[PDB]
What does this fold into?
Amino acid sequence: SRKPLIAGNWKMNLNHYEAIALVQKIAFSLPDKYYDRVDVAVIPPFTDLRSVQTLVDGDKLRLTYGAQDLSPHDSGAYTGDVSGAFLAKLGCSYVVVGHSERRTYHNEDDALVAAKAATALKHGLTPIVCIGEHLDVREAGNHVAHNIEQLRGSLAGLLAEQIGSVVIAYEPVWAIGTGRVASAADAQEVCAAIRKELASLASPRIADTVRVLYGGSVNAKNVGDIVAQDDVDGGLVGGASLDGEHFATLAAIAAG
Amino acid sequence: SRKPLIAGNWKMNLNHYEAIALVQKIAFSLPDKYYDRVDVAVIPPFTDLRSVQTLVDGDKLRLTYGAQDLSPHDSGAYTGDVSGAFLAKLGCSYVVVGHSERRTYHNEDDALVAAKAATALKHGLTPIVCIGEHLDVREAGNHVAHNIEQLRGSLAGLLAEQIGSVVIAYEPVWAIGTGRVASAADAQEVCAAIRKELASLASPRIADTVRVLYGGSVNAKNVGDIVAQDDVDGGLVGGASLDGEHFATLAAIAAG
It folds into this structure.
């Protein structure tokens, strides 16, 4: 089976002591037994990573953590940018690449996302490679093909075993601020097509190991229907990740 | 007089262990008498800031520190981005805005830089507002005017009193990787024109308090000539900032 993953994208929220308080809310809210059945990760801003790392390692917590971006380069004259080497040294397990906010606000195209994914893997990090279509594509009925094409572009250059080392997240961007709602069936249709394409880019065996997460709006009342879907392996969670009790509840549901 | 400022832009270099080692080397290397004569700051990657804060505060160091960028927003759905609220809580004194590398690699324009400067000030941070012309402009002889227009655009929206709370850095981008070399006289020409413009944008009294740094190649061989100039108040240092002894040496020279 694929072990489900519930990863909380905090976005640009929470300072370093707020970070510690949130991680403690989660740790003290989620019964230990659940970790054998679900992987649970927090994804704080860069500036919170030291604080989270030392809490998680110092208290031997079973939650893992990650970052929200990284440079396609390893080091050098890139003022403002953060290397995957730094994230690795901090013990990060995951790094989000290609989030729709970065694609939109920061002009990140598929090729850059692919480069970031490769660099993540060079530093032993698991990239969470995000894809998803806008409402115009969805309305045209071309959402499956568009997602496949975006996946191919965002994984370009990766070898089959490298594909086996990524996570994919499907963001139904067409359901953000448009008033549209993505159903569990909508999620399953795309995540099934993702897995079929991964089987081509790698192998069926490898595609069957890759976690494909839902990255739309997740809460306690919809998470179970979504993660119950055959090809959906968890969630890249937005706003609910900032409420420790709520986030713990998502993890418990995804576990069983 | 204006007290000189030597600020070390680490760029995308040094993990959190290396950051600690470097700051301790700097503190070991720079005699305490020098801080009454020069202000010294380190500008690490985001992921090193907590580590640097705890060392500075716990060792009661006289060096200060800052970050290499920030969002124009305070919080929200900006995956990957870092808030000036976070930087303030980490005890940063400075934040670099509009570094040439961000203008070139990340498409930041003067208006974005001005918004970042304003947001830095809202969080009690001193923005280091970077400007500088590329080779084509220098080769045309229009460099002063180009810099003054960039300065005006990169400080747009700031009130006269807020201009008193910024630092300016002149980057001779035309001499960065081109084979051209900027002299101390070249720095003084632009820095004097920057101050003249600050006198117009703000007032002559405010302009005489604003630190204007040189942000080209600074090393132990040229720092004295640079800081000797009438309108140059220090350096935004690159690669020499990564060697604790060398960096301490720069500060010592800048101090007398």
Q: What stands out?
A: The longest strand of chain B covers residues 126-131. Chain B has one domain: 1-256. The domain at 1-256 of chain B is CATH 3.20.20.70 (TIM Barrel). The longest helix of chain B spans residues 184-201.
